[PDB]
Amino acid sequence: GPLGSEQRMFKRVGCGECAACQVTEDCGACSTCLLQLPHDVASGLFCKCERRRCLRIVERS
């Protein structure tokens, strides 16, 4: 951006660097994200693509 590419506050957003934070959906190649039931009837479930989890968690708000 015009004021740089650094973030002063990660508002529920990824590091912007690692693959996982580039990925937005289930990559379709994790033992877990293969278990993505499209007929979801809840609002939670930690059973999701582990390539949504930052490989270098540094965006802690």
Side-chain angles (χ1 to χ4, degrees):
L3 71 167
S5 188
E6 184 57 272
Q7 295 77 32
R8 60 181 297 164
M9 174 61 182
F10 297 96
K11 301 182 274 66
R12 303 305 181 211
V13 66
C15 67
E17 297 170 63
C18 84
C21 295
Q22 310 304 333
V23 183
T24 53
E25 297 183 280
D26 63 281
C27 83
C30 308
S31 309
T32 318
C33 75
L34 269 49
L35 304 173
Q36 298 302 151
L37 300 178
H39 195 263
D40 189 283
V41 292
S43 190
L45 285 80
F46 289 84
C47 55
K48 287 180 174 58
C49 183
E50 296 175 67
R51 302 293 76 155
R52 283 276 46 232
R53 297 177 178 183
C54 191
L55 280 303
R56 295 190 295 122
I57 312 173
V58 290
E59 61 280 84
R60 193 182 187 190
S61 304

